[PDB]
């Protein structure tokens, strides 16, 4: 270089400033932890400058350092801590117009940095730092420290993160192991306490184990007979089929609007430790019983008296057969002409999707459903599901239909992505921007809300100039104070996948009784 | 007596001590306590030593650290006046004499003024910083006064086949220099190296290949076409952290490097607005209060697109922009900002001149005489303002005191008259002693923004020559430099833009 040109005796900055106040925060937890019989001394916590390794983002990884069979076999759960004072260099995409050019710079998520060669890099680390040349590797979901965080101000949340990242690397290499899977059989006993839901509507936003605010308007859970099972948070969004709009035009002599369920959270319950596949489907069952009683209507049913013009059902008026603003905030608020209103304007049936997360809580599961959708790795993931869910059934879950046959999910091409804004005193997520809201705040303007729902979908524009429309629209609704975290695909189950899953958990054992 | 020069004797005493485990630098300096009880002087100082005996004759390098107080009496004197010939002299025989070898020379490597209004318990690292960097100029400078292979083009390409690019960014958070004083920075051009062995075995690593960057922003003026003028005022000029050398020839490449903003209009950037955003003194409609109708476009509105602001721009300013610097006496460049300042005019403008010639000829070899003289005609000019920096605080920030450029006052006062021209004549008018205006100056910025600002220093504004800053570029395009630019600045047919040339004015008039 030439730096060294001119050997000049001095030698200014670092080029790392989190990474030292996290190891001496994380080794004065540990230390807690295991002086008063918390955590077993086993496992060792590392550390890993980015700078040495020739590596974007500086990432700490938790080791748990047991063999096996007697070939020596490692577990280790990264932990990013991406940094606002070193910004990486952003991408840059070309998009032609006419006869000229343009070059858009986007900047990079903690997604796209977790690439193949940085866990090569982290497991030759490892596997030079514990001794163990010959160990097999293993993840159990990397996930980021976001940036907002105060490193001296987050005792708890940070124990408990340490906490939950030795428990799933534990229940990682235990299930290279192969323990006992917990089929339902296990549940049921000489004892007669059914499970039960107790499907409940939510305003504030559930939190993650850091402190990131995630949508969630519906949840639905297990219960027995102060033990509970699952937990399934999820939203309701609207989507517009394109015939629908056509007879409304061109007429001839069905509903102008689809609801879609979004599946955001899907961790198992606060009280369980344990985190495995059977725990994930048998959550995932849940997600399909709050369409009993038309439950995932409940948040489109207009609030106690609070405005929240990011949720009035009014919007529909804007597209439908009459114009302007509905005037539900009348005395005619009533439940029964809401239930006519959603009964000639949006189908009765649902579909499901789920915002997939490459690096959230359960991102080594989430992967597994990514290249279930397509991929090179695609039938062997059909297979790992479908030989998963025959585990937690137990029975010939292959009777009900076949994987080859018919896909699990599609892919839809899309992009979400995660983040935050600060409104009043608590902050909510990002993903609450939707389609009703936006057409709520365009109070009308056919091609403004047209150009949005263009801007979320379309398949005939670069997905970066998708994004930077996106995030250009966020940035205009809700205040300009967005910060962005991560980035989520959003993928629909096909209707066959869910509609045979809970039949086959109801021939298997289904003791549930809910109310509505 | 002087708390204040005890407090940072000891402070950097233990940042000494804390600083010789041979984790970075070296031992072969001193720190120096030179406090206004020891001698009849102002402000107290705390100043490094390097000695170095090159051929013989010992010569001891300082850089002093002025300590202003805000505990005791001034003598308005600010840091660049107490600073000007008595302190320098006293200072010299201080090291002269107790250093114990006199019968030497000092050089005054860049002074620099720590802010008073800082409290050092809490800024180990600030100081940290400003200690490390001023062992290093104090080092770099003896690298100029003892004969030494000066920097070259040639050294880009780093004994290899290595491409250079530069780019520019729009930013809103205004830059922080060593101490935590912040600088007013809009528009910043950034030239770094571009590897093209296929981008392998660094996947989004940045490794170091910043070379330098140039920070600015855009002032209007206005004159008696379009009546208002462009002009953009050059802020910090300091190159990349990777490099730790600061030498003249940094400095002549990151001014090459500022002139690369006037493709694709990128000064007219931090003018368009930004949607979502309304926090004002800062859009562009304030200039329809100077025009023919007396209203404020509706820049926000959906009405105002990209090409209607393109239009704004032919319609109002005119298409060329002048270019400004803002020379600081007691900054971070000071001991190289001295030699521009001392060409602006003066007893020594053609030694100062003939040493600039000189200096910026040692870049390339190229003969810069051919290309632009220094007798033909002056390379900047001072225009007279004595625009000054401080910082003054809000929305939980602190901010420059340049962010009060004209266009800011134009919507802080609306369209009022008699009160803008007042503004403007108050930053600079020739019938009056400039006392009075700096006076009002104050006043003004105490008016339209928050009393709680402070002020720092000094410092003068000056402008560059049209075509010296021209030939400057063609210099460093035929020494060979392959800089790449990109993107640049709805889009429907507005006027040929060509037709006007051609005019051929009067008829033949054949009798």
Redesign the interface.
Known sequence: ???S??T??????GGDARASEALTVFTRLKEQAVAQQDLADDFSILRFDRDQH???WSSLVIAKQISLNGQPVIAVRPLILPNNS?E??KR?TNIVN?MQT??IESD?DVG??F?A??FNRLSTYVQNTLGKPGAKVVLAGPFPIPADLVLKDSELQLRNLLIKSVNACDDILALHSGERPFTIAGLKGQQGETLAAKVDIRTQPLHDTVGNPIRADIVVTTQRVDVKLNQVAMFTNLERTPQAQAQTLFPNQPAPWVASVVITDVRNADGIQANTPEMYWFALSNAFRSTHGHAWARPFLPMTGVAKDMKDIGALGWMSALRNRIDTKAANFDDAQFGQLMLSQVQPNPVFQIDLNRMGETAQMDSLQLDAAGGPNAQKAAATIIRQINNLGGGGFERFFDHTTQPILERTGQVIDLGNWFDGDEKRDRRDLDNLAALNAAEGNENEFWGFYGAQLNPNLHPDLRNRQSR?YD??YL??TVTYTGKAERCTYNAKFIEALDRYLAEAGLQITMDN
Do not use: W
């Open positions: 270089g030439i730096n040109q001119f000049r005796s001095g030698n200014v900055q020739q590596v974007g070193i990486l260099p840059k006419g343009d070059v990079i796209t940095v690439s060669q940085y250009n940035r205009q205040g300009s």
